[PDB]
């Protein structure tokens, strides 16, 4: 948590790399329970953390210490293994590449999604950041497993505001929070009132 020290000052633990668990208050709904791994703290907005929850494919951005929907936030002593990946070479060249990522439907039929591998994830470094042309939010998977099974085939504005023209005719405002290193025209965007991380080529 943020610990008052007091009037103009607050202290907080460095929680990047830590396992956490907390409740989440769905708006006018029940409390849901969550556990995951803190991957990063965003430089342009240091109260925003990027989180990977166990069993949930999207990477989320939450202001863990300030968002009032978060309750009973617990930072665990658990130590996340720093694994030395199966093949650093194969991982590192996969970065910045367009890919065809095979999923399968309930129907058992094939469903092939065009994507882009963006980076190796921080902290959980055998996992990769990836986004999709038809679903431009940030996802995270152990893509070396997909690759070896043959289910994966290989082919600054940070700080600025963005406005997105919603289909309604509404306008969604957000902030550019990260520049992809392997591809500096591609950025992560956090929209207010949405906890997904959007990924767009801003050129």
């Amino acid at each position: 948590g943020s610990s008052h020290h007091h009037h103009h000052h607050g202290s907080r633990r460095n929680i990047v790399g830590c396992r956490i668990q907390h409740g989440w208050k769905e708006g006018n709904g029940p409390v849901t329970q969550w556990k995951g791994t803190v991957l990063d703290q965003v430089p342009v907005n240091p109260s925003l953390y990027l989180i990977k929850y166990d069993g949930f494919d999207c990477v989320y951005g939450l202001e863990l210490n300030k968002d009032e929907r978060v309750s009973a936030l617990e930072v665990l002593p658990d130590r996340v293994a720093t694994s030395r990946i199966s093949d650093a070479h194969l991982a590192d060249t996969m970065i910045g590449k367009a890919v065809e990522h095979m999923f399968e439907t309930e129907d058992g039929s094939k469903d092939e999604w065009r994507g882009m591998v963006l980076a190796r994830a921080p902290v959980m470094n055998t996992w990769f950041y990836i986004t999709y042309e038809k679903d431009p939010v940030l996802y995270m998977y152990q893509l070396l497993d997909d690759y070896k099974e043959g289910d994966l085939r290989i082919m600054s504005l940070v700080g600025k505001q963005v406005e997105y023209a919603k289909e309604d005719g509404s306008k969604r405002t957000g902030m550019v929070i990260h520049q992809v290193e392997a591809k500096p025209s591609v950025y992560f965007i956090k929209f207010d009132d949405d906890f997904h991380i959007y990924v767009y080529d801003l050129v």
Partner: peptide, 9 residues
């Protein structure tokens, strides 16, 4: 192959 998840919100 992986299956696509339903996700909240």
């Amino acid at each position: 192959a992986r299956t696509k998840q339903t996700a909240r919100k």
